[PDB]
Design an enzyme around this catalytic site. Structure first.
Site, PDB file in Angstrom:
ATOM      1  N   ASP A   1       0.743  -0.897  -0.192  1.00 31.69           N
ATOM      2  CA  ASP A   1      -0.436  -0.460  -0.230  1.00 31.69           C
ATOM      3  C   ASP A   1       0.433   1.380  -0.283  1.00 31.69           C
ATOM      4  OD1 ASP A   1      -2.174   1.901   0.627  1.00 31.69           O
ATOM      5  OD2 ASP A   1      -2.277   1.324   2.259  1.00 31.69           O
TER       6      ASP A   1
ATOM      7  N   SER B   1      -4.979   8.277   6.631  1.00 31.05           N
ATOM      8  CA  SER B   1      -4.095   8.015   5.367  1.00 31.05           C
ATOM      9  C   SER B   1      -3.230   8.158   4.300  1.00 31.05           C
ATOM     10  CB  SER B   1      -5.365   7.558   4.546  1.00 31.05           C
ATOM     11  OG  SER B   1      -6.221   6.894   5.741  1.00 31.05           O
ATOM     12  N   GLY B   2      -2.172   7.117   4.692  1.00 33.54           N
ATOM     13  CA  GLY B   2      -0.719   7.823   3.380  1.00 33.54           C
ATOM     14  C   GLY B   2      -0.310   8.456   3.605  1.00 33.54           C
TER      15      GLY B   2
END
Ligand SMILES: [Ca+2]
Ligand code: NA
Length: 223
Positions: A84, A177-178
């Site tokens: 991811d 996220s990220g």
């Protein structure tokens, strides 16, 4: 970030906000022209906002720069969330200064118990939702590869680590996220997945950046 605190303004100078009409994910400035983030954050249009503290007000340190290239890891699996990771090339180089700076990639993988800093503009409520204006911060340790694997039986690959607290109350959440996990001046983690956030015996699961330095450097060199 649930159970964190408001970062000092511009104290996380590698933290970016990925914007498409509004903030949707974090990222990390790793070169003047490149941001690393999570492949599950992919959108075809992204504006990178560097130098932010308050994402809801212009404070004078911001640089808004559109993404020119958006490259997901070719082995990203949307089911297992293996690999991811995503690279974003900026349309013009970020201008580096005290408030906009790169973070080092890993020299080595991090030991279990290494203290890290997790940051972002994600949800701050453990029940309901509140999305902050101001960048949130969280001090958290790298959990044992074991303590990670007990929490998610058969779901932790070699490209994932857990960082956080088994008692709950302290985690990254949706919208973080990220974003970065930085441990001794190195980007060791990318906010990836979990089972909700800040729940008991469900620590955040992070992309293990120390497995990806070759892929990152090769992809930058190629573009
Ligand atoms: Ca701002
Ligand atoms: Na989580």
């Amino acid at each position: 970030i649930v159970g964190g605190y408001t970062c000092a303004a511009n104290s996380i100078p590698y933290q970016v906000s990925l914007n498409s009409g509004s903030h949707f994910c974090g990222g990390s400035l790793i070169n003047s022209q490149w941001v690393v983030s999570a492949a599950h954050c992919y959108k075809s249009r992204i504006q990178v906002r560097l130098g932010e503290h308050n994402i809801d007000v212009l404070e004078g340190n911001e640089q808004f720069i559109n993404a020119a290239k958006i490259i997901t890891h070719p082995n990203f699996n949307g089911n297992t969330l293996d690999n991811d990771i995503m690279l974003i090339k900026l349309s013009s180089p970020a201008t580096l200064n005290s408030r906009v700076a790169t973070v080092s990639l890993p020299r080595s993988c991090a030991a279990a118990g290494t203290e890290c800093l997790i940051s972002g503009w994600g949800n701050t409520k453990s029940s309901g939702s509140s999305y902050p204006s101001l960048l949130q911060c969280l001090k958290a340790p790298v959990l044992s590869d074991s303590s990670c694997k007990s929490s998610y039986p058969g779901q932790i690959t070699g490209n994932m680590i857990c960082v956080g607290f088994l008692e709950g109350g302290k985690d990254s959440c949706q919208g973080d996220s990220g974003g970065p996990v930085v441990c001794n001046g190195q980007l060791q983690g990318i906010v990836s997945w979990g089972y909700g956030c800040a729940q008991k015996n469900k620590p955040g699961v992070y992309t293990k950046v120390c497995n990806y330095v070759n892929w990152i450097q090769q992809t930058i060199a190629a573009n």
